[PDB]
Ligand binder design. Structure first.
Ligand SMILES: Cc1cc(F)c2[nH]c(=O)n(C3CCN(C4CCOCC4)CC3)c2c1
Ligand SMILES: CCCCCCCC/C=C/CCCCCCCC(=O)O
Ligand SMILES: CCCCCCCC/C=C\CCCCCCCC(=O)O
Ligand SMILES: CCCCCCCC/C=C\CCCCCCCC(=O)O
Ligand SMILES: CCCCCCCC/C=C\CCCCCCCC(=O)O
Ligand SMILES: CCCCCCCC/C=C\CCCCCCCC(=O)O
Ligand SMILES: CCCCCCCC/C=C\CCCCCCCC(=O)O
Length: 446
């Protein structure tokens, strides 16, 4: 190729590599230097940054030299090893995105059961298996295909994957590395968004009715409580309540906690309440029949009265499962509950009557940094890997239709995912953005 083309491509690919190596190092150092970033989900982000660092420093630079030189000069053994390192790191990134998606899925859908298992030790176990599965699946086929076929069909001065020669096998790998992971992650995201907004509404409902307290207080029984009726301990000690609070959050709070930390505790209490409802033979048929809004009004009653208290409304529960909401509203209002808390009872009864949030006046979806990051890193994956996967799709129906140049650009677009991944964290998380700025200004300072 021309000397002018060699300089132009080397500069663009070089600057892209520099942006990839810098961004993923900044992401890794951020989790290392900042304690507030040292969360179980950020262990997977560190693992993803490791895969993206190989892509930036090794894959990108070595693939660009291969295109510029127009041939492979390092030999057949260096070639297959280079391709093995490349494919395993690229798949490890996809596996890490699946780990981020599943962790976010189980922590939102199951805040009680899953957070018993959500320790850093289990995150490290899942990270290692993800990297090991990527290796066991792609490296043996990359290196030993030539021995199983009986010949190395890749010429000297050429470096490419031998088993990806036929377009149907390329499509097979595309299904396993793109089409199936994307489908799985999208289905997981629709469930995470629906669950998050559903739980938020229960949180905002009880914030109006029961009340939210950021500091440790004593309940009616005299036990230390926090947030929306979250029991810390039954022990008559302030320090014991503080120790149990620091255990539940993971930091030295010393009495005071944030709204988001109180929401985390409340969602464990919602899971504990729903566990009791399904285990109660008198509350299970009505709960299964009610919609998301009317289920929350039943949970509201469980948080105030208790399991057996709501079960006392034999007449009312029967009319709610029969979808006769005007009838059940009359029986619910004619009780000791309505007389004790008239303002709260009317709001809950109206919720059962209408099946809407008109009694409370609710705000739109508060898209938390974690939800925004997941959506950004998933869209980043779809955007950068779509060109190559469309080329694979047209390759199956069109033999040798895709030119050498297009494959080279489609390969380079897949690597751009590694460049834009730390940008997604910076754009969605304020704690990452500030640490990125902090580390960059600290590096410029000698
Ligand atoms: C480092 C290196 C050196 C070379 F000489 C290469 N030759 C060659 O064809 N590649 C490909 C580059 C793209 N990569 C993708 C495939 C889709 O999944 C994400 C990774 C597969 C190997 C080479 C890579
Ligand atoms: C086991 C891990 C795999 C890594 C080992 C593969 C060998 C890679 C060697 C890289 C040396 C860099 C030389 C740069 C010139 C490239 C010239 C070319 O081949 O076109
Ligand atoms: C050729 C080089 C390949 C190296 C890949 C190694 C596999 C990556 C392993 C995972 C890194 C561990 C992630 C957890 C770090 C915790 C960060 C912290 O909070 O201190
Ligand atoms: C775990 C780290 C291992 C990485 C070591 C990399 C060493 C690669 C060395 C060069 C291999 C060249 C061997 C000659 C192959 C034949 C060349 C040809 O087909 O023209
Ligand atoms: C021959 C190709 C060479 C490529 C080497 C890089 C590929 C990574 C391979 C698998 C190692 C598995 C990583 C396990 C480390 C555990 C890290 C942790 O979770 O703390
Ligand atoms: C997409 C990202 C673009 C960055 C990388 C440079 C790739 C350039 C390769 C095309 C040159 C084709 C040729 O061999 O003539
Ligand atoms: C950031 C954007 C910059 C993009 C840089 C990459 C530019 C590469 C573009 C393609 C030029 C095409 C090269 C000519 C190949 C001819 C092969 C043929 O005739 O089939």
């Amino acid at each position: 190729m021309e000397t002018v083309e060699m300089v132009a491509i080397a500069t663009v690919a070089g600057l892209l590599s520099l942006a990839t190596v810098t961004g993923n190092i900044l992401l890794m150092l951020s989790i290392k230097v900042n304690r507030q970033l040292q969360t179980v989900n950020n262990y997977f982000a560190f693992s993803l940054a490791c895969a993206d660092l190989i892509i930036g420093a090794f894959s990108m630079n070595l693939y660009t030299v291969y295109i510029i030189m127009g041939h492979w000069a390092l030999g057949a053994l260096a070639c297959d090893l280079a391709l093995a390192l490349d494919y395993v790191a690229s798949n490890a990134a996809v596996m890490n995105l699946l780990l981020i998606s599943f962790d976010r899925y189980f922590s939102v859908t199951r805040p009680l059961s899953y957070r018993a298992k959500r320790t850093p030790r289990r995150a490290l176990l899942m990270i290692g298996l993800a990297w090991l599965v990527s290796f066991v699946l792609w490296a043996p086929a990359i290196l030993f295909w030539q021995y199983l076929v009986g010949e190395r069909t890749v010429l000297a001065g050429q470096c490419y994957i031998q088993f990806l020669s036929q377009p149907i096998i390329t499509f097979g790998t595309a299904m396993a590395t793109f089409y199936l992971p994307v489908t799985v992650m999208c289905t997981l995201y629709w469930r995470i968004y629906r669950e998050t907004e559903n739980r938020a509404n229960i949180f905002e409902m009880l914030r109006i009715d029961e009340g939210l307290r950021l500091k440790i207080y004593k309940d009616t029984e005299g036990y230390y409580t926090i947030g929306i009726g979250h029991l810390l301990t039954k022990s008559p000690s302030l320090n014991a309540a503080k120790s149990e609070l620091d255990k539940a959050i993971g930091r030295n709070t010393n009495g005071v906690i944030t709204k988001d930390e109180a929401e985390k505790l409340f969602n464990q209490d919602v899971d504990a309440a729903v566990r009791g409802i399904l285990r109660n033979a008198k509350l299970k048929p009505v709960y299964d029949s009610l919609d998301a809004v009317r289920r929350a009004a039943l949970i509201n009653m469980v948080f105030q009265m208790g399991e057996t208290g709501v079960a006392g409304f034999t007449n009312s529960l029967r009319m709610l499962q029969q979808k006769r909401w005007d009838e059940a509203a009359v029986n619910l209002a004619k009780s000791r509950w309505y007389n004790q808390t008239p303002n709260r009872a009317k709001r809950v009864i109206t919720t059962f009557r209408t099946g809407t949030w008109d009694a409370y006046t609710f705000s739109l979806v508060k898209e938390k940094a974690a939800l925004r990051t997941l959506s950004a890193i998933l869209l980043a994956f779809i955007l950068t890997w779509t060109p190559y996967n469309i080329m694979v799709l047209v390759s199956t129906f069109c033999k040798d239709c895709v030119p050498e140049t297009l494959w080279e650009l489609g390969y380079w677009l897949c690597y751009v995912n590694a460049t834009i991944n730390p940008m997604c964290y910076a754009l969605c998380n304020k704690a990452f953005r500030d640490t990125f700025r902090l580390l960059l200004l600290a590096r410029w300072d000698h």
